[PDB]
């Protein structure tokens, strides 16, 4: 019966005033679809991963996620058995079926209003507290997961730690870091090159030890939103419109799709270079790394070799007086990682350990990262802009970076779309102005 | 009055209007959209560009084209019956006969089409500001597909019908022409930029100014088509920019007209530049700098840096790009940075 | 009576001021002022700056490379990469200069400041009852500017490759990219060309048809551009009188019947593709570059049969090599 009383078509979707059992079961509808992809694509990833081949040489982005927790792991990052994977994959397609089963419901035979039928699973946007409460509620559902990791890294098989003594190997984080200043200090500073807001994490316990500080806060949020009605200030500001809520809760994602797009790109820890690709900076280092060994072995003395620009052929100082790789590779001196660290000193690279201590394995690992650097093509074909057609891997870190932005952006502009038009409902302009009463025609025209 | 008989039919308001223009626009504006598509998936230009054109060759949509004739040709209008193919669509084809066929037709088809607006604008009776505005693309084409080759060597170095084909053309100029530094083109840019902003500044400036002269929360119902007077009070919109961007309009009578200028205006600009190009008479250098560079290994501006890329995009390019002129570029001679 | 601050906040939100000093403007204005006056001066006597890491100061400018098309404001040094270089760092203002400290200072102000505009661009959209999506079309703009000033930088190593703010530095930065990513061989750059090569062919029409369709109010006694006295709720130009033509140019249905369909879309074309390109760039900020057809086309024996996109290659290989010569000591350029 809509399209005539209902506003538009494309924008046909959106019918929702005080409540609606079609839109409720529509988010439970999609929030189910989403589940479908998780599994389907998972069963599409295991349905492929060659016996033993780089996890990133094959277009895998989900499988690598499962690995970081410690499923299929293996000392170094090598999948032990193609099973832990298939568990989450199918448990998701059967999860997906469950999501399917009752969404179409609230969607076609599900009770319209949430006031006529139920009286608790019923809202109204102007409903200051009903909304307020549900908040602390899903906040609690998050305070829960916010702990899954806590006991997964602490109780059911710790997280894969590529920062492990012997190398990459799922260890069990037993000492989460619960130091208020160090975990609350992470977010509170470091924006640019120095370090990242939080894409800047060194050890796997600052994360687990913090994902602990998060599972409570949000958990203790529900006992706050579920338990209280808005305060005395925030009443003002905020357009508690229905639409507006889509915006307040929306333009947040844009922020995260960005603070995400930077995580897949820089973070080595939570983004094990072994499961995904070798961070853009990492590859750039492996470039020098290689040719430094290559050249040092051929008898060159890296310490003293003077660049062609006159700078430093293989090594040059940093504005901190530390020692770092030259070439162009300089831009990436802040980068850290397990294959290098031992070959690192007190004032930056150590002229000594770099000369002999240069053990045999770090050579190929730092060689892999060169060959496979975060660069590809619109039509798959790893390599620089103009590389003949041969290799064809495109870094996962590249797809996950590209992906999330494109979305992360549209969203910010999506925040605008609604956050500003919803500011037109509580004002009644939305739909244009009143052909007889126009506020600019009753103003002392500046000239 | 048989004349008026033909007329009477032709210009009879069908579904897709025919008319006098039609005897020109339509035929030519066909073999052209046509010939392009024909060769686009069937002919190869392996005999002039030793490259693959047609999809049949495996080419990709982008990489496909009806590449100009071998520079060995000249400006001969490569007729099917001309001393070239001597009459032989096959040969005429291999000799890249079509590109002349695709340009001249598209030429006259671009003629018939401006005349096509003029016909109508006269019939329905309206200011000839459409056809007038068609000068913009008229010039442009003429400049880059007719005068240019003509002013250069062969039809060869003329644009070639394909996308990766013309993508070529851009870097060509950047290479041996340094187009990006020709004042004129910097207005062509100017136009297609100012105009793309206007198309939308006015575009979203209308959608967000109009009124509630309909019912729903949707505007496709709001009054029209020609009834109620004006949807957007240019007074409520005016005062918004004169407080935001400082200076706003008044009299959409010129806004529209100013919207005519910007693009068609500037576009035309480059077209001149291009004519400068057929004559290689271009804006490449800045003597004042060359001399200040010559004697000073310490003097460096983007002027210079850019300038190099050019040399790169020419020493590496040329040989395989201008085969007729058998270039023998030894690896050494090859200019290229340090470590690359 | 309301305390002094109550006045303050009405003066900033007063729909009366010659120009709105919106809340977003209390940050925009001080900001943009900074960007400009710094720059405009740096543009006069910009001390030789050393973009790339190599200590070889490349400084176009006025009192140094006195030209308009040469000069510019030059970038940041690899040295200090993606690092924040606060003028209060350089143990000497003269240091700040070498490293192009002025760059950051300006670019960050113009960045956040123009978003403030994006913001205080909607502040009349509300402080004045009227559809707010004006600032939304300013997204195609602000964003893109960011894509070339913030994103690519976070992308690659450091601000070293951030569209220097110069006429030629533009061209330069443009080229670099086209050699490091096949952005011309991209279906994202395409969409900007889609809309830009559109807003143009298009601004040309609505302008065209709109003037081509105006009543009768002067008879060359003077101008025809007087055919509308500002303020009239009439529409100097006829609509169906207009469409009547185009509908006739290209078979009906193809010409716009409704004005609302007309215009509005007039945004639709640009802003859509303008975002895309803005992204295309923000995308090759993690190196998901244009398609690769290098060689792609092959022969029976295996002889290589050049695609057009093959030549396009040399035009890149060419510059690829020459670009920032002497600034890389290894064989593969990952930035």
């Amino acid at each position: 019966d809509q399209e005539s009383s209902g506003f538009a078509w494309w924008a046909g979707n959106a019918r929702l005033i005080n409540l609606s059992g079609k839109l409720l079961g529509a988010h439970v509808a999609h929030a189910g679809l989403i589940v479908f992809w998780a599994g389907a694509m998972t069963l599409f990833e295991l349905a492929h991963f060659i016996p033993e081949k780089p996890m990133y040489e094959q277009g895998l982005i989900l499988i690598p996620h499962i690995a970081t927790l410690g499923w299929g792991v293996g000392p170094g990052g090598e999948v032990v058995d193609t099973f832990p994977f298939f568990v989450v994959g199918v448990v998701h397609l059967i999860s997906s079926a469950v999501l399917g089963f009752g969404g179409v419901y609230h969607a076609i035979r599900g009770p319209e209003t949430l006031e006529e039928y139920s009286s608790f699973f019923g809202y109204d946007w102007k409903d200051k507290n009903k909304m307020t409460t549900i908040l602390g509620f899903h906040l609690i559902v998050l305070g829960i997961g916010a702990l899954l990791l806590v006991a997964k890294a602490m109780f059911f098989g710790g997280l894969y730690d590529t920062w492990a003594p012997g190398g990459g190997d799922v260890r069990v984080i037993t000492n989460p870091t619960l130091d208020p200043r160090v975990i609350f200090g992470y977010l509170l500073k470091s924006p640019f090159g120095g370090e990242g807001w939080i894409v800047s994490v060194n050890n796997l316990e600052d994360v687990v030890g913090g994902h602990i500080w998060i599972g409570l806060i949000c958990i203790a949020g529900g006992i706050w939103h579920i338990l209280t009605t808005p305060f005395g200030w925030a009443r003002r500001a905020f357009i508690w419109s229905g639409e507006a809520y889509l915006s307040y809760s929306l333009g947040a994602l844009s922020m995260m799709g960005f603070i995400a797009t930077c995580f897949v790109w820089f973070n080595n820890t939570v983004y094990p270079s072994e499961f995904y690709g070798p961070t853009g900076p990492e590859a750039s280092q492996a470039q020098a790394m290689t040719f430094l060994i290559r050249d040092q072995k051929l008898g060159a003395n890296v310490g003293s070799a003077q660049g062609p620009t006159g700078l430093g052929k293989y090594l040059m100082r940093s504005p901190t007086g530390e020692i770092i790789f030259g070439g162009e590779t300089m831009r990436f001196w802040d980068f850290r990682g397990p294959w290098l660290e031992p070959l690192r000193g007190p004032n930056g690279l150590d002229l000594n350990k770099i000369k002999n201590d240069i053990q045999p394995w770090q050579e190929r690992r730092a060689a892999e990262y060169m060959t496979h650097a975060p660069l590809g093509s619109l039509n798959s074909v790893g390599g620089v802009a103009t590389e003949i057609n041969s290799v064809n891997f495109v870094s996962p870190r590249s797809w996950l970076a590209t992906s999330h932005f494109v979305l992360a952006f549209f969203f910010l502009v999506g925040h605008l779309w609604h956050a500003g038009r919803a500011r037109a409902a509580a004002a009644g302009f939305e739909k244009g102005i009143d052909r007889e009463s126009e506020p600019v025609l009753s103003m002392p025209s500046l000239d | 009055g048989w004349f008026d008989i033909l007329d009477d039919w032709l210009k009879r308001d069908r579904f897709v209007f025919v008319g006098w223009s039609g005897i020109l626009l339509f035929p030519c504006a066909y073999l052209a959209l046509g010939g392009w598509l024909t060769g686009t998936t069937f002919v190869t230009s392996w005999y002039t560009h030793g490259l693959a054109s047609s999809y049949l060759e495996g080419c990709n949509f982008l990489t496909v084209a009806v590449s100009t004739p071998a520079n060995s040709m000249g400006h001969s209008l490569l007729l099917l019956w001309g001393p070239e193919a001597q009459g032989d669509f096959t040969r005429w084809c291999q000799l890249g006969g079509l590109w002349t066929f695709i340009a001249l037709h598209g030429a006259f088809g671009l003629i018939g089409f401006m005349l096509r607006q003029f016909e109508i604008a006269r019939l329905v009776g309206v200011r000839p500001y459409n056809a007038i505005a068609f000068s913009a693309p008229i010039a442009v084409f003429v400049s880059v597909f007719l005068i240019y080759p003509l002013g250069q060597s062969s039809w060869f170095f003329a644009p070639s019908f394909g996308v990766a084909a013309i993508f070529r053309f851009l870097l060509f100029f950047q290479g041996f022409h340094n187009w990006t530094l020709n004042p004129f083109h910097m207005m062509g840019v100017a136009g297609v930029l100012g105009g793309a902003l206007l198309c939308a500044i006015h575009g979203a400036t209308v959608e967000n100014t109009l009124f509630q002269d309909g019912e729903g929360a949707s505007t496709f119902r709001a009054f029209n088509p020609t009834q109620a007077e004006e949807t957007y009070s240019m007074v409520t919109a005016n005062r918004f920019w004169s407080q935001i961007f400082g200076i706003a309009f008044s009299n959409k009578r010129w806004l529209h007209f100013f919207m005519l200028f910007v693009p068609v205006t500037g576009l035309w600009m480059s077209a001149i530049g291009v004519v400068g190009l057929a004559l290689n008479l271009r804006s490449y250098d800045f003597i004042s700098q060359e001399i200040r560079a010559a004697e000073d290994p310490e003097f460096e501006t983007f002027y210079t840096k850019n300038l190099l890329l050019n040399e790169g995009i020419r020493a590496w390019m040329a040989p395989q790009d201008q085969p007729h002129e058998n270039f023998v570029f030894p690896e050494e001679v090859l200019p290229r940075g340090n470590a690359l | 009576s309301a305390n002094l601050w109550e006045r303050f906040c009405n003066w900033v939100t007063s729909t009366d001021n010659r120009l709105y000093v919106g809340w977003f403007g209390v940050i925009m204005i001080p900001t943009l002022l900074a960007a400009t006056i710094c720059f405009v001066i740096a543009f006069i006597a910009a001390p030789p700056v050393d973009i790339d890491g190599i200590r070889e100061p490349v400084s176009g400018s006025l009192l140094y490379g006195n030209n308009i098309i040469t000069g510019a404001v030059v970038p940041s040094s690899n040295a200090i990469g993606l690092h924040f270089y606060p003028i209060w760092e350089a143990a000497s203002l003269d240091e700040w200069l070498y490293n192009g400290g002025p760059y950051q200072l300006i670019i960050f102000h113009f960045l956040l400041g123009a978003s403030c505009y994006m913001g205080r661009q909607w502040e009349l959209s509300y402080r004045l009852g009227m559809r707010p999506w004006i600032c939304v079309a300013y997204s195609a703009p602000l964003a893109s500017a960011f894509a070339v000033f913030l994103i690519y930088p976070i992308g690659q190593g450091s601000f070293s490759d951030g569209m220097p703010l110069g006429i030629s530095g533009t061209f330069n930065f443009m080229i670099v990219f086209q050699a490091e990513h096949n952005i011309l061989m991209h279906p994202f750059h395409q969409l900007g060309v889609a809309g830009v090569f559109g807003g143009a062919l298009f601004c040309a029409m609505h302008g065209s048809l709109v003037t081509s369709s105006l009543i009768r109010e002067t008879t060359e006694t003077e101008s025809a551009n007087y055919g509308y006295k500002f303020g009239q709720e009439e529409e100097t130009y006829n609509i169906v009188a207009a469409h009547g033509y185009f509908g006739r140019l290209i078979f009906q249905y193809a010409s716009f019947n409704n004005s609302r369909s007309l215009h509005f879309f007039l945004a639709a074309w640009r802003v859509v593709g303008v975002w895309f390109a803005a992204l295309g760039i923000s995308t090759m900020a993690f190196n998901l570059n244009g398609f690769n057809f290098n060689h792609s086309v092959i022969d029976a024996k295996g002889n290589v049969i050049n695609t057009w996109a093959d030549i396009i290659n040399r035009a890149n290989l060419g510059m690829e090599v020459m670009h920032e010569r002497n600034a890389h000591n290894f064989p593969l350029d990952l930035a």
Partner: peptide, 30 residues
Amino acid sequence: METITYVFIFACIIALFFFAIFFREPPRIT
């Protein structure tokens, strides 16, 4: 010179700006 000219043609774009943002001949609603 060469620079003296550049800073001039510029400082007038600044005057030309001041002038059309404050010396705007008001738009009349009739």
